Amino acid sequence: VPRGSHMASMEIFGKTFREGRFVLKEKNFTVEFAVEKIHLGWKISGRVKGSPGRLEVLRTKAPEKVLVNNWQSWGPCRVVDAFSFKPPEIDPNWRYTASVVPDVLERNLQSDYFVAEEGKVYGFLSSKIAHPFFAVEDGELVAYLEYFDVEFDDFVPLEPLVVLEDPNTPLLLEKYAELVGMENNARVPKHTPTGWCSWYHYFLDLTWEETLKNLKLAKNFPFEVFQIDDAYEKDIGDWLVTRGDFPSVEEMAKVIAENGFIPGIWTAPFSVSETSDVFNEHPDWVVKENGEPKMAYRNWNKKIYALDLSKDEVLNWLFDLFSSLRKMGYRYFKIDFLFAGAVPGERKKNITPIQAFRKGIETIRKAVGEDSFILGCGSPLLPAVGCVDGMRIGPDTAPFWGEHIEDNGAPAARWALRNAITRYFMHDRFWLNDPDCLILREEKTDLTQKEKELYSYTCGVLDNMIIESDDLSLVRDHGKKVLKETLELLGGRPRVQNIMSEDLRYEIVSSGTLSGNVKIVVDLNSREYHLEKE
Ligand SMILES: OC[C@@]12C[C@@H]1[C@H](Oc1cc(F)cc(F)c1)[C@H](O)[C@@H](O)[C@H]2O
Numbered sequence: 053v054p055r056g057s058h059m060a061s062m063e064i065f066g067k068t069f070r071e072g073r074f075v076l077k078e079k080n081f082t083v084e085f086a087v088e089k090i091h092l093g094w095k096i097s098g099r100v101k102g103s104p105g106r107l108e109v110l111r112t113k114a115p116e117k118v119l120v121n122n123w124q125s126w127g128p129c130r131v132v133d134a135f136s137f138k139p140p141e142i143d144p145n146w147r148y149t150a151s152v153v154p155d156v157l158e159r160n161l162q163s164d165y166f167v168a169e170e171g172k173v174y175g176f177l178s179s180k181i182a183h184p185f186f187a188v189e190d191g192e193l194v195a196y197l198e199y200f201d202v203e204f205d206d207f208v209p210l211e212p213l214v215v216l217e218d219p220n221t222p223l224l225l226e227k228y229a230e231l232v233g234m235e236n237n238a239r240v241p242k243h244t245p246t247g248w249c250s251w252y253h254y255f256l257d258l259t260w261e262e263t264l265k266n267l268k269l270a271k272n273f274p275f276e277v278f279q280i281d282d283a284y285e286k287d288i289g290d291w292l293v294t295r296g297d298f299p300s301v302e303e304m305a306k307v308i309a310e311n312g313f314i315p316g317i318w319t320a321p322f323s324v325s326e327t328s329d330v331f332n333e334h335p336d337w338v339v340k341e342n343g344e345p346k347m348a349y350r351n352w353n354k355k356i357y358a359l360d361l362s363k364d365e366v367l368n369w370l371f372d373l374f375s376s377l378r379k380m381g382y383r384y385f386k387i388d389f390l391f392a393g394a395v396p397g398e399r400k401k402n403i404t405p406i407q408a409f410r411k412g413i414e415t416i417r418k419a420v421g422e423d424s425f426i427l428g429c430g431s432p433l434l435p436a437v438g439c440v441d442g443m444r445i446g447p448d449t450a451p452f453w454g455e456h457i458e459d460n461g462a463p464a465a466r467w468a469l470r471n472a473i474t475r476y477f478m479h480d481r482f483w484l485n486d487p488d489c490l491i492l493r494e495e496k497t498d499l500t501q502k503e504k505e506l507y508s509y510t511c512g513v514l515d516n517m518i519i520e521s522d523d524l525s526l527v528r529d530h531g532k533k534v535l536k537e538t539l540e541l542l543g544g545r546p547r548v549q550n551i552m553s554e555d556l557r558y559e560i561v562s563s564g565t566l567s568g569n570v571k572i573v574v575d576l577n578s579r580e581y582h583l584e585k586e
Pocket residue numbers: 126149251281282318351388429430444448461
């Protein structure tokens with residue numbers, strides 16, 4: 053069992069790579085780590101104390117072509133040329149969706165949690181304290197654990213790192229993900245919800261009158277969940293105060309339940325706008341910069357602040373909120389813009405943003421109980437494993453393909469679908485993947501029948517969550533046929549065979565579906581598919 057030349061060339065915590073047990077006593081920190089052989093490769097694990105800061109874990113030559121992954125739901129997972137990378141201009145209103153360490157990204161190629169090349173996966177198994185990421189720094193791939201200047205008096209566990217090699221790159225990614233699910237006690241529900249969502253037909257203009265119309269019609273469709281999205285609430289943070297023609301949040305649940313659905317509701321639970329009642333009552337409850345409220349992002353034409361999830365007052369408010377929703381009968385919770393809870397800044401306790409983030413989502417889980425389904429959105433991915441049941445893994449879909457939409461996080465069916473493909477390996481390992489809603493209506497849309505089919509059947513072959521978002525008056529024979537045949541493709545184990553493709557054509561197999569072994573070949577440039585079912 054000789055060492056590859058490329059393995060002898062690798063540095064672990066600054067030392068020449070080799071198997072063994074080691075101690076780095078450095079100026080302001082100490083690390084104790086082991087490098088151990090595992091199936092398909094190596095695992096680097098151990099413990100750290102002191103002020104590790106931005107801690108260098110691994111260094112090796114950058115590959116030419118890398119599969120890079122953004123930390124959160126909406127960001128791209130895609131293959132990039134590592135030598136011709138150009139730093140992006142970052143939208144100052146959405147800085148932290150692009151990166152939790154934006155000094156890196158504005159200079160160098162950044163990949164969060166994992167990175168891959170043909171034949172090789174480097175991936176961290178968890179994000180419980182540090183943010184784990186990779187940067188390409190002058191032709192070199194460097195793995196880091198970011199501790200955000202927090203000091204640790206006693207040892208805390210490192211986030212483990214695996215380095216896996218095999219010529220079957222999809223197999224490596226699936227193995228990586230099974231290791232993540234074990235490290236974090238992932239929730240993989242045995243049942244997948246079907247349902248309806250308001251957002252991608254009505255957007256913020258949903259009325260309760262239109263909601264009631266769809267509630268009646270939804271009885272003709274195979275929907276278990278009826279979820280109300282952003283529209284009902286008076287302000288961001290004030291989740292139990294309604295506007296317009298909506299009744300009370302409790303009354304909405306009762307009407308929905310009386311009509312025989314599981315009620316579902318959208319919140320952005322770590323976000324409070326500058327105008328909200330909660331913020332104006334509790335200016336002290338938010339993350340700060342130089343003592344003042346730190347904008348987390350701008351949306352809805354307002355500055356939006358982040359709740360400080362290190363504060364017990366804030367965690368009690370979250371518990372009471374989600375406990376109050378549970379009492380009302382909600383059992384499906386779409387929790388959005390979660391990245392806000394993990395923004396860098398000043399908190400009451402000197403803990404990391406990731407430690408803060410995890411206390412918040414853990415509180416939500418406790419409050420809604422084991423019988424509620426949590427769907428994460430706009431969220432850091434690895435820190436949420438073990439807490440959420442489903443997770444949005446792409447940018448928003450849209451009632452158009454997005455011919456003039458670039459690959460930059462704006463809504464477009466084409467880029468939403470691409471992420472459902474490139475992150476496919478998380479599915480049934482981290483959680484249920486949510487590829488975002490099907491849009492099957494045949495008026496008030498620019499999608500063709502073929503584009504609807506392509507999106508929906510790819511989602512079914514991937515075994516992903518299937519939720520529809522339409523004015524159900526506008527969905528006729530074709531849309532009902534697409535939904536029916538989609539649900540027939542569920543239940544398998546998918547693999548994207550050519551995960552390193554750069555031309556947006558993918559071959560996808562899934563074994564053991566409700567239609568047997570299936571194969572779809574999809575081309576996201578030509579907008580064509582070819583589906584075979586055994
Ligand atoms: O405000 C409601 C809403 C749009 C927000 C969220 O989609 C966004 C995704 C973004 F990158 C930015 C943004 F402002 C919104 C989410 O992903 C959607 O499904 C839906 O719930």
